[PDB]
Short mmCIF file of C-alpha atoms in Angstrom, two decimals:
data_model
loop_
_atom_site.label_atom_id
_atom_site.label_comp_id
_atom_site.label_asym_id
_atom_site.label_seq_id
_atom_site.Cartn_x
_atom_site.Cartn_y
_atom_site.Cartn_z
CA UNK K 1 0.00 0.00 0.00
CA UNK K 2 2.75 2.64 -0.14
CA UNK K 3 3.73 4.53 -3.20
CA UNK K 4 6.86 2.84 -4.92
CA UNK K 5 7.27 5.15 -8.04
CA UNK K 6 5.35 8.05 -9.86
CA UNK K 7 5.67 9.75 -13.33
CA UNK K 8 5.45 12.64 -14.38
CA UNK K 9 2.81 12.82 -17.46
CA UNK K 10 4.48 16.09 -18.94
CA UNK K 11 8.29 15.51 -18.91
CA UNK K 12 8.98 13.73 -21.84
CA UNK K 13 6.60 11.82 -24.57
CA UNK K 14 7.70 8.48 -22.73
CA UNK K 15 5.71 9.67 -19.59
CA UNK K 16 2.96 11.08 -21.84
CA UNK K 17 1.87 7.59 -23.06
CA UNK K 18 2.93 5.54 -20.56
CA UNK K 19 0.04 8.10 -18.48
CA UNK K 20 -2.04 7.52 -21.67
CA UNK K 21 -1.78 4.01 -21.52
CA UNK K 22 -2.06 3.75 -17.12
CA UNK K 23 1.33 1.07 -17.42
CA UNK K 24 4.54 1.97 -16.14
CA UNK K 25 5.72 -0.39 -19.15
CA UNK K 26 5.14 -0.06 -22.46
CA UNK K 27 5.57 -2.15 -25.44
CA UNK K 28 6.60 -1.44 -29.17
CA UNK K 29 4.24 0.54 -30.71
CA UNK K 30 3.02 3.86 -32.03
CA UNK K 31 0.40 5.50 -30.16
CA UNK K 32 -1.59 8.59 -30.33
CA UNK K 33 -1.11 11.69 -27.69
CA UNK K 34 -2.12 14.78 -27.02
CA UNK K 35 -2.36 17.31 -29.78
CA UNK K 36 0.23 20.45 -29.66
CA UNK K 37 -1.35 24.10 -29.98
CA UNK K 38 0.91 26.77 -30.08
CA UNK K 39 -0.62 29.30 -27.11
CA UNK K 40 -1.02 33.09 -28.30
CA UNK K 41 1.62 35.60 -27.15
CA UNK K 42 -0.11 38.19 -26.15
CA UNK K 43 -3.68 39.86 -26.23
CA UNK K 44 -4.83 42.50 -28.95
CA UNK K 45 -8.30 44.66 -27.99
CA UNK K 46 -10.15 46.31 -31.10
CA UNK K 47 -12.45 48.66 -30.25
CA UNK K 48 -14.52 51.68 -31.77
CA UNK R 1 -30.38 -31.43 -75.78
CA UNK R 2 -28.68 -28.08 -76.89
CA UNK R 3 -25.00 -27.91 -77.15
CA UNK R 4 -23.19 -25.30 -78.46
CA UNK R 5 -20.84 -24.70 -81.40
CA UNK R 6 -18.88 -22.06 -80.32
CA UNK R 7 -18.24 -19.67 -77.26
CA UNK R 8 -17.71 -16.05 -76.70
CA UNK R 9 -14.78 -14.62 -74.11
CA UNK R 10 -16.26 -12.16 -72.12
CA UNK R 11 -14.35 -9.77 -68.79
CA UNK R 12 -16.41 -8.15 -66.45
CA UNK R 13 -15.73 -5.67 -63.75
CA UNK R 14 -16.86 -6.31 -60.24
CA UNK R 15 -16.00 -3.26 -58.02
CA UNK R 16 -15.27 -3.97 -54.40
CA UNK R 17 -14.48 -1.79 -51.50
CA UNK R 18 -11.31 -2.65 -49.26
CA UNK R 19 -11.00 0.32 -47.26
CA UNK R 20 -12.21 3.82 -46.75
CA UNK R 21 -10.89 6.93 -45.27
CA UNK R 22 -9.15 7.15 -42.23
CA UNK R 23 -10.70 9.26 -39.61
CA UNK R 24 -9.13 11.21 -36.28
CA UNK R 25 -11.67 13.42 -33.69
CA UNK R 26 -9.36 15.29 -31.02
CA UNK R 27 -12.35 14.64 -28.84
CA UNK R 28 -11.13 18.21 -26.31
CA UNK R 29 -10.37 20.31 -29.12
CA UNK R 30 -13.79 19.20 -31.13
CA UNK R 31 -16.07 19.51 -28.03
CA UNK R 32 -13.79 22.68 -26.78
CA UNK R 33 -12.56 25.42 -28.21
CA UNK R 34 -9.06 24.92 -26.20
CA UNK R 35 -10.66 26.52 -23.65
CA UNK R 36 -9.91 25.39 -19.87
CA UNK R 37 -13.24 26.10 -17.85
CA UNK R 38 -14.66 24.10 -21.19
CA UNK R 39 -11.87 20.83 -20.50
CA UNK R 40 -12.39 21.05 -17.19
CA UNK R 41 -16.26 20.50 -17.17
CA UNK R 42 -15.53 17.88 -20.26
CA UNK R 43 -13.22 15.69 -17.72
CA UNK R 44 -16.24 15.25 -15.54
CA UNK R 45 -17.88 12.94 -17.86
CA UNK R 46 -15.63 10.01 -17.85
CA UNK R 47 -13.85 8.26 -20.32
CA UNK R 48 -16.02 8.69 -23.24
#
């Protein structure tokens, strides 16, 4: 019942599926993560 | 009894499907507009 190891889903794509697939191992494969969106810089206010 | 004299070679087509087009849904980005308040009400239903 105690807590033998952790990982971190956003460190590298490794962690990403193995959080994807809930298994500390994973086997050969390609599999499908989270889609990248590139965030907006800054904010731009148009008015009258 | 009717046998015949001579014969005709004939090809015809027969058009089969074997696949179709692939298909993708980023289920988050679809439902939300990569919003946050939006994901984090989505997350509450599950694993759909």
């Amino acid at each position: 019942g105690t807590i033998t190891d952790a990982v971190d889903c956003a460190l590298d794509p490794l962690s990403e599926t193995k959080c994807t697939l809930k298994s500390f191992t994973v086997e050969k494969g390609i599999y499908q993560t989270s889609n990248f969106r590139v965030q907006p810089t800054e904010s731009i206010v148009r008015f009258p | 009894i009717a046998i015949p004299t001579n014969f005709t070679i004939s090809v015809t087509t027969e058009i089969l499907p074997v696949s179709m087009t692939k298909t993708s849904v980023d289920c988050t980005m679809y439902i939300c507009g990569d919003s946050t308040e939006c994901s984090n009400l989505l997350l509450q239903y599950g694993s759909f």
